[PDB]
Amino acid sequence: NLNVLDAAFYSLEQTVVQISDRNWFDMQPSIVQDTLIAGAIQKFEFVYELSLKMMKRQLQQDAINTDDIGAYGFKDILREALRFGLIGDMSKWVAYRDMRNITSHTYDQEKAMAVYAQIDDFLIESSFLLEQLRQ
Protein backbone atom coordinates (compact mmCIF):
# COMPACT_ATOMS: atom_id res chain seq x y z
CA ASN A 1 0.00 0.00 0.00
CA LEU A 2 2.31 2.80 1.05
CA ASN A 3 4.06 1.80 -2.28
CA VAL A 4 0.97 2.88 -4.13
CA LEU A 5 0.94 6.38 -2.68
CA ASP A 6 4.64 6.34 -3.39
CA ALA A 7 4.10 5.34 -7.08
CA ALA A 8 1.29 7.91 -7.32
CA PHE A 9 3.50 10.70 -5.78
CA TYR A 10 6.22 10.13 -8.37
CA SER A 11 3.91 9.97 -11.33
CA LEU A 12 2.52 13.40 -10.20
CA GLU A 13 6.02 14.74 -9.70
CA GLN A 14 7.10 13.35 -13.02
CA THR A 15 4.07 14.87 -14.67
CA VAL A 16 4.76 18.39 -13.32
CA VAL A 17 8.27 18.03 -14.57
CA GLN A 18 7.23 17.40 -18.17
CA ILE A 19 4.71 20.27 -18.05
CA SER A 20 7.43 22.42 -16.48
CA ASP A 21 9.82 21.86 -19.41
CA ARG A 22 8.37 25.06 -20.98
CA ASN A 23 10.12 24.43 -24.21
CA TRP A 24 8.29 21.24 -25.11
CA PHE A 25 5.06 22.31 -23.53
CA ASP A 26 4.61 25.53 -25.48
CA MET A 27 5.37 23.72 -28.73
CA GLN A 28 2.36 21.30 -28.27
CA PRO A 29 -1.03 21.87 -29.74
CA SER A 30 -3.39 23.54 -27.24
CA ILE A 31 -5.48 20.35 -26.73
CA VAL A 32 -2.37 18.38 -25.72
CA GLN A 33 -1.55 21.09 -23.18
CA ASP A 34 -4.98 21.25 -21.63
CA THR A 35 -5.19 17.45 -21.45
CA LEU A 36 -1.89 17.25 -19.56
CA ILE A 37 -3.15 19.93 -17.12
CA ALA A 38 -6.36 17.84 -16.53
CA GLY A 39 -4.27 14.62 -16.21
CA ALA A 40 -2.15 16.51 -13.67
CA ILE A 41 -5.25 17.61 -11.73
CA GLN A 42 -6.40 14.01 -11.81
CA LYS A 43 -2.97 12.82 -10.47
CA PHE A 44 -3.14 15.49 -7.74
CA GLU A 45 -6.50 14.09 -6.60
CA PHE A 46 -5.01 10.57 -6.34
CA VAL A 47 -2.05 11.65 -4.11
CA TYR A 48 -4.35 13.85 -2.05
CA GLU A 49 -6.98 11.04 -1.54
CA LEU A 50 -4.27 8.35 -1.07
CA SER A 51 -2.51 10.64 1.42
CA LEU A 52 -5.58 11.02 3.56
CA LYS A 53 -6.10 7.29 3.72
CA MET A 54 -2.50 6.45 4.57
CA MET A 55 -2.57 9.31 7.09
CA LYS A 56 -5.86 7.99 8.60
CA ARG A 57 -4.34 4.52 8.82
CA GLN A 58 -1.14 5.67 10.63
CA LEU A 59 -3.35 7.60 12.94
CA GLN A 60 -5.44 4.52 13.75
CA GLN A 61 -2.35 2.44 14.36
CA ASP A 62 -1.02 4.93 16.91
CA ALA A 63 -4.13 5.84 18.79
CA ILE A 64 -5.67 4.94 22.06
CA ASN A 65 -8.60 3.87 19.89
CA THR A 66 -10.04 4.06 16.36
CA ASP A 67 -13.59 4.76 17.63
CA ASP A 68 -12.57 8.33 18.45
CA ILE A 69 -11.55 9.88 15.10
CA GLY A 70 -12.08 7.75 12.02
CA ALA A 71 -15.78 8.52 12.08
CA TYR A 72 -14.79 12.11 13.09
CA GLY A 73 -13.83 15.33 11.21
CA PHE A 74 -11.29 16.37 8.64
CA LYS A 75 -9.87 19.05 10.86
CA ASP A 76 -9.58 16.57 13.73
CA ILE A 77 -7.69 14.21 11.47
CA LEU A 78 -5.33 17.07 10.67
CA ARG A 79 -4.67 18.34 14.24
CA GLU A 80 -3.95 14.79 15.25
CA ALA A 81 -1.78 14.23 12.21
CA LEU A 82 0.02 17.37 13.25
CA ARG A 83 0.48 16.16 16.79
CA PHE A 84 2.19 12.93 15.69
CA GLY A 85 4.34 15.02 13.32
CA LEU A 86 2.87 13.54 10.15
CA ILE A 87 2.54 16.91 8.48
CA GLY A 88 3.99 20.26 9.05
CA ASP A 89 1.19 22.67 8.33
CA MET A 90 -2.48 21.76 8.57
CA SER A 91 -3.19 25.00 6.80
CA LYS A 92 -1.70 23.62 3.62
CA TRP A 93 -4.16 20.64 3.85
CA VAL A 94 -7.27 22.59 4.71
CA ALA A 95 -6.34 24.40 1.48
CA TYR A 96 -5.75 21.07 -0.36
CA ARG A 97 -9.21 19.87 0.55
CA ASP A 98 -10.65 23.14 -0.73
CA MET A 99 -8.69 22.47 -3.91
CA ARG A 100 -9.92 18.92 -4.26
CA ASN A 101 -13.49 19.91 -3.65
CA ILE A 102 -13.43 22.08 -6.74
CA THR A 103 -11.45 19.94 -9.16
CA SER A 104 -14.88 18.88 -10.44
CA HIS A 105 -15.12 22.46 -11.75
CA THR A 106 -11.90 22.10 -13.69
CA TYR A 107 -13.61 21.95 -17.15
CA ASP A 108 -13.36 25.71 -16.87
CA GLN A 109 -9.75 26.45 -17.94
CA GLU A 110 -9.17 29.33 -15.51
CA LYS A 111 -10.26 27.16 -12.67
CA ALA A 112 -7.89 24.49 -14.05
CA MET A 113 -5.00 27.06 -14.04
CA ALA A 114 -5.85 27.98 -10.48
CA VAL A 115 -5.54 24.34 -9.28
CA TYR A 116 -2.37 23.61 -11.29
CA ALA A 117 -0.67 26.77 -9.86
CA GLN A 118 -0.98 25.23 -6.38
CA ILE A 119 0.45 21.88 -7.27
CA ASP A 120 4.16 22.61 -6.84
CA ASP A 121 3.60 23.61 -3.25
CA PHE A 122 1.34 20.59 -2.93
CA LEU A 123 4.23 18.31 -3.90
CA ILE A 124 6.25 19.73 -0.93
CA GLU A 125 3.88 18.84 1.92
CA SER A 126 2.81 15.51 0.50
CA SER A 127 6.50 14.79 0.06
CA PHE A 128 6.96 15.50 3.71
CA LEU A 129 3.90 13.50 4.65
CA LEU A 130 5.05 10.40 2.82
CA GLU A 131 8.62 10.68 4.27
CA GLN A 132 7.03 10.58 7.66
CA LEU A 133 4.94 7.60 6.69
CA ARG A 134 8.03 5.68 5.30
CA GLN A 135 9.28 5.79 8.95
d(CA 28, CA 55): 38
Catalytic residue among 22, 83, 97, 100: 100
Q: Which is nearer to a second copy, 82 or 123 (CB)?
A: 123
Per CB under 8 A, the list member of 55, 86, 93, 106 interacting with a second copy is 106
Q: Shortest approach of a second copy to residue 4 CB, angstroms?
A: 7
Q: Does 118 bind a second copy (CB under 8 A)?
A: no
Q: Does 95 engage in binding with a second copy (CB under 8 A)?
A: no
Concerning whether 79 is annotated as a catalytic residue, the answer is: no
Compute the distance between CA of residue 92 and CA of residue 72 in angstroms, rounded to an integer: 20
On the CB side of 101, CA atoms within 13 Å amount to: 7
Complex with a second copy: residue 25 or 63, whichever CB lies closer:
25
| Interaction between residue 36 and a second copy (CB under 8 A) | yes
Between 49 and 62, whose beta carbon lies closer to a second copy?
A: 49
Least spacing, CB of residue 1 vs a second copy, in Å: 12
Q: How far is CA 21 from CA 18, 37, 38, in A?
A: 5, 13, 17
Residue 2 sits in the site that holds a second copy (CB under 8 A)? no
In angstroms and rounded to an integer, the radius of gyration of the C-alpha atoms of the chain is 16
Is 105 tagged catalytic? yes
Three-state DSSP class for 87?
coil
Say how many residues make up the chain.
135
